[PDB]
Paper text:
The most frequent PTM reaction catalyzed by [name] enzymes is the addition of AMP using ATP as a cofactor, coined AMPylation or adenylylation. We discover that EfFIC has both AMPylation and [name] activities borne by the same active site. Furthermore, the conserved glutamate implements a [name]+-controlled metal switch that tunes the balance between these activities without conformational change.
We determined crystal structures of unbound, phosphate-bound, AMP-bound, and ATPγS-bound wild-type EfFIC (EfFICWT) and of unbound and sulfate-bound EfFIC carrying a mutation of the catalytic histidine into an alanine (EfFICH111A). Two crystal structures were obtained by co-crystallization with a non-hydrolyzable ATP analog (ATPγS), for which well-defined electron density was observed for the ADP moiety. E190 has the same conformation as in other glutamate-bearing [name] protein structures and is stabilized by a salt bridge with Arg122 and, when present, by interactions with the nucleotide cofactor. Based on the observations that the α- and β-phosphates of ATP bind with canonical positions to wild-type EfFIC and that AMPylation is potentiated by mutation of the conserved glutamate in various [name] proteins, we propose that the primary role of this glutamate in AMPylation is to mitigate the efficiency of this reaction in the presence of Mg2+, rather than to fully repress it, possibly in order to match AMPylation and [name] efficiencies.
Numbering used by the authors:
A (entry chain A), B (entry chain D): 6 to 207
C (entry chain E): 10 to 207
D (entry chain F), F (entry chain C): 5 to 207
E (entry chain B): 16 to 207
The structure:
Amino acid sequence: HHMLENKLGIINQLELNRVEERVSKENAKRLYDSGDIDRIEVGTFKGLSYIHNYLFEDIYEFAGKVRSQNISKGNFRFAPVMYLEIALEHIDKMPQRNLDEIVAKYVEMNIAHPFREGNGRATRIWLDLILKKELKRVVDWNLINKEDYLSAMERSPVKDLEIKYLISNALTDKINDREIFMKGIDISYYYEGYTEYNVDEL
Amino acid sequence: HHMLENKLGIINQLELNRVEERVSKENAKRLYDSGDIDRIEVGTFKGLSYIHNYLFEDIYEFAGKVRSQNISKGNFRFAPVMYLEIALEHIDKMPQRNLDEIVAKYVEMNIAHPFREGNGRATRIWLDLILKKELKRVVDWNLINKEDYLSAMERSPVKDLEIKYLISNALTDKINDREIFMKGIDISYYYEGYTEYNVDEL
Amino acid sequence: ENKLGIINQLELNRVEERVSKENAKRLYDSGDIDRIEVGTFKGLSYIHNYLFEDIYEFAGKVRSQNISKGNFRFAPVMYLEIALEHIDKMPQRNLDEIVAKYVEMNIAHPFREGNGRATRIWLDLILKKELKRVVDWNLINKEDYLSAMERSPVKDLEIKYLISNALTDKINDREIFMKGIDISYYYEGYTEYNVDEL
Amino acid sequence: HHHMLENKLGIINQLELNRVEERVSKENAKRLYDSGDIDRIEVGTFKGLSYIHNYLFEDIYEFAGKVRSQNISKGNFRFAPVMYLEIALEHIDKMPQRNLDEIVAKYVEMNIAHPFREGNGRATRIWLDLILKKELKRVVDWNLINKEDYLSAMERSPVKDLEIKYLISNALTDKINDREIFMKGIDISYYYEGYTEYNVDEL
Amino acid sequence: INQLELNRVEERVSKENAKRLYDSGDIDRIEVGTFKGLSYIHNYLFEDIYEFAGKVRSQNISKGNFRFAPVMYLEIALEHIDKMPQRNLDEIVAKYVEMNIAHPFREGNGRATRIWLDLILKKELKRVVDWNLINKEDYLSAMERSPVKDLEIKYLISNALTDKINDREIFMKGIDISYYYEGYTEYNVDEL
Amino acid sequence: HHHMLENKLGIINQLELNRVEERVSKENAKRLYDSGDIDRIEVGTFKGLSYIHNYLFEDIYEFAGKVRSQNISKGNFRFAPVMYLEIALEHIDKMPQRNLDEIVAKYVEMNIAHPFREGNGRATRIWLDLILKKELKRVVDWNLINKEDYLSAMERSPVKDLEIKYLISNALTDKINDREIFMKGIDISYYYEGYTEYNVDEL
Ligand SMILES: Nc1ncnc2c1ncn2[C@@H]1O[C@H](COP(=O)(O)OP(=O)(O)O)[C@@H](O)[C@H]1O
Ligand SMILES: Nc1ncnc2c1ncn2[C@@H]1O[C@H](COP(=O)(O)OP(=O)(O)O)[C@@H](O)[C@H]1O
Ligand SMILES: Nc1ncnc2c1ncn2[C@@H]1O[C@H](COP(=O)(O)OP(=O)(O)O)[C@@H](O)[C@H]1O
Ligand SMILES: Nc1ncnc2c1ncn2[C@@H]1O[C@H](COP(=O)(O)OP(=O)(O)O)[C@@H](O)[C@H]1O
Ligand SMILES: Nc1ncnc2c1ncn2[C@@H]1O[C@H](COP(=O)(O)OP(=O)(O)O)[C@@H](O)[C@H]1O
Ligand SMILES: Nc1ncnc2c1ncn2[C@@H]1O[C@H](COP(=O)(O)OP(=O)(O)O)[C@@H](O)[C@H]1O
């Protein structure tokens, strides 16, 4: 699964964590600066798969591809592989006209959790693209506290009020401001326990 | 709670996470290199409080003192504040003769969760000292996968088999090896989302 | 979110009660209630639309969003259709099977709202056809009922006991029906009107 | 015996009992405010909460104003055990209430304590408003908090109080002596609990 | 050593103790509805088998997803239970449900506390439980549910109550069914 | 209907029914091994598992070897919905089984599927052992897995299978054609499920 392990000779979890952060943040920076981010299908699993492969190819085996194993976090079982493809088609047809509908679509894509790893970071980029297109807003992720965010996502399959509230109060109209995107990548990786680098210095 | 946030006027989450890592890891290196770690009471809340205050004095308000608020993680509500002092009295009297008793005592101290923050890093140092005294072993924490460790702790209030096997298989006889300690500190902080520095380079 | 354009929650509660109870009275007194298919989603959909089409755009139609209550996630939309086909084929010969079928219909929770009130009407029509009984709903305490439904996806013992001990043979008694409407609405927090007096 | 109006004239079913309990205690809530009695209650203590509960439910609930002697639950949640209830209320009495974070934590602990057999919801929200009024010069406009949002947030709150804090924070108003805020808040608060027949204004 | 063999020995030895408890008349002489009475029952059944039989555990225990009363409150919880009323079925079942949450022994709480429950019902309602009339999986599910709502277990108990409160065969067959609930099926207690 | 012997023989006592169902199905398990029939079963497929289930239970359970038609639960866990059993079982048939990680994940999914009304635990463990024998040249020495450890690990396994994987891994033996391991394993397996009356050897 961790393609860099055998290639760089890493036998330490923290060292592997840092290298995967560096390489994927390099790809994340290029995604934005190349303008490739603007030519991705918005709000579909085809767009999400592209983001995920863009971030993690040469890092995760099968980056951009659905997982073949069932996974969980805390006590929550994500969508079973057996109807994973069915779930993703449903999400593709969900509406995205207002914040209520966009947050619900994001919550369902987190529940699907289609990749083995990288779901959190890749789906937040995907979410920002839906908000930018439909609401002319993106998230200022530093205004969402890490533990508040993770608690809200844990709560969200049952009730999405917490994550909707957090997102709503962090929306900004500066949808073409490069620094907001870049600051948000560092915060987004921080949520997942990657704190070594700043995307802008790579 | 976060003293550096209010003192230095930090307003970026990631910056606060990094400086809180730097200063507490600087203290962690001193704790070991000064020999102060070898003079602590072993297996008591007094000894755990000393460790917690050593790491987090001037970082967390009331470091080394029991919290006055109720806290939770995921879906789990930790020991009520009303009953914390008597819960710690019970843990002090728990036996620690073998791996079973030691792990059960560790699991109860995690359930007590006596500090507002920092329970994970502080209690793992405390655990290593119990294992050292009673079994002449310490944990090689890099041998315990981060996600395996965190899921095992979430499980442990119901059944501690998972954490016990993870600890058992990671034990090493190198109880006075500085490299094992320092690498364990870095892995331990990595479990909790701090990856910026290496402790022995501070 | 509604045809009446009401955006005050307490006002919506009261007008929904009066309007849907008005429709419920007509369902019964018109005899329309006796011409519903018994024990199928078609018939539940007919009841739900009868009650709610004045108010809610979706009346009688399967939801397209996912919903939950308490800590329970109801049947996912992606297999709502197949879930309802399965329920349509479940047996209803005795009380054990009728309660099982009711419990699965609640798990499906097919409408955006109104599932509780519409499906209890639907249940009474199954009991009436197969056991010549209906529920005397005031004999079921509100909090016992709600907690029994919360338990029922795991085990249906609680709700089965409550229904069994409240069955009555007065299956054509208009006051048993009307008071059952009022108690059923009371379960869901609507208490202003008596359907009888509308 | 808990419902002391159980056997009165015309009280023949659960709905009729619900309605008379709504009318009598809302009549009490109106007098509580319009008499000025509400302004004399000790703020932020269990002594204050029991005065409110007794004011609303005296002669409706047996033992109104008194701590329950039975354990109770709601949904999947077990409230504080009776065996240490009085000590739990003493600890709540000492909790700070200087800012919104602290006030909401104190409210959440009082709801976990759930000290009465019934009527905890409605009595404790009035109590909450008086704390907010004294300490922040704000009260909750309960009409800006949806019923199902509110109930779910309370179910969430023993684990994390973020949901209910957001709902309270966005509904705060500085109209702390506005009669309609209070009166409509009483009607909304009762509607949260399944009582909808009357407007407190009109009793 | 074989797990099954230990299980069979424990059944045989403790079921013998249950028969003596009833046949000797000792069961009629114990305090009804208190932890002291329950402790006497547990020691009587398991004296030879469990270390610290009849004594409150010193470890925290769980079953399924349920964490039983933590040891530090165990004494105060048993004290509360001792004071709980037992005048009707609602109160008895609540008292029984609280004693199961307490779970005061390391093992054998189920079998000892059901004997204890029958004695409360005998004294206060002049009824005991015909345990064969409560299906095993119905019972265990109802007990899992009981800390949240006791309606399930109350209905099962109510429909199984019999007025044959001094009938030796009701008690002995109840003992067999009670052990069956917990996975001991080898012996019939009256054939010991 | 489900318990075929209950009405045919008028067995009214739950313990007596438990013991006769143990005796009949354990007689069948003994014959499954001693006849060589076990060695012709397809390995790792629902067809093979259905063969085992019917072989043990066809005189005891109305639809032995056949998928259930109702939904079922155990503890707080709701097993795979009936509407999905077919797709679940088709997916499980395609899962790899080359190493212990993959075999355990496959066993965990077959338990979640829980395809029969009753008898899933005992039948699926025989099925598991035949996969391990084929792919790893090991079987489980079940007496080395404590009953409550096993039941707790299975309760845990839909979330994380590490607990059950450790128990299994540490109980593997290379004595894959040892009759005592198989027979004692049958007695322990039945003991896990609350059947302790007979020794399968002596039937
Ligand atoms: N208990 C939970 N239930 C549901 N979703 C969760 C839970 N905990 C975290 N999440 C969501 O899962 C995401 C993590 O997915 P993962 O594939 O691990 O991403 P990454 O590789 O980016 O860390 C989090 O960012 C959060 O959105
Ligand atoms: N759901 C859970 N239930 C119980 N314990 C947990 C859970 N999740 C994590 N833990 C334990 O709590 C620790 C974190 O406690 P915390 O006070 O946040 O420490 P730190 O400041 O070092 O991160 C983890 O290392 C783990 O041991
Ligand atoms: N936690 C729960 N789990 C499953 N079912 C529930 C739960 N709580 C309530 N129910 C059932 O759901 C019904 C409410 O559904 P809803 O669509 O809100 O109907 P209504 O609009 O009539 O109130 C209740 O009447 C009860 O039958
Ligand atoms: N599942 C739950 N867990 C914790 N608290 C809850 C839950 N559901 C509701 N609550 C809180 O409990 C209150 C109900 O208490 P109760 O004594 O019934 O008051 P009332 O008589 O006013 O209805 C609700 O207003 C809400 O604050
Ligand atoms: N998940 C659960 N939650 C609470 N109580 C339970 C649960 N499962 C079983 N019980 C109760 O616990 C009893 C088992 O207790 P235990 O100490 O193992 O007794 P025994 O040694 O007699 O088997 C059961 O008879 C039942 O009453
Ligand atoms: N809470 C649970 N969640 C998931 N699986 C469980 C749970 N409890 C037990 N199991 C699994 O289910 C099996 C029992 O299924 P069952 O069909 O009753 O088999 P049997 O008839 O052999 O007793 C157990 O052996 C265990 O593998």
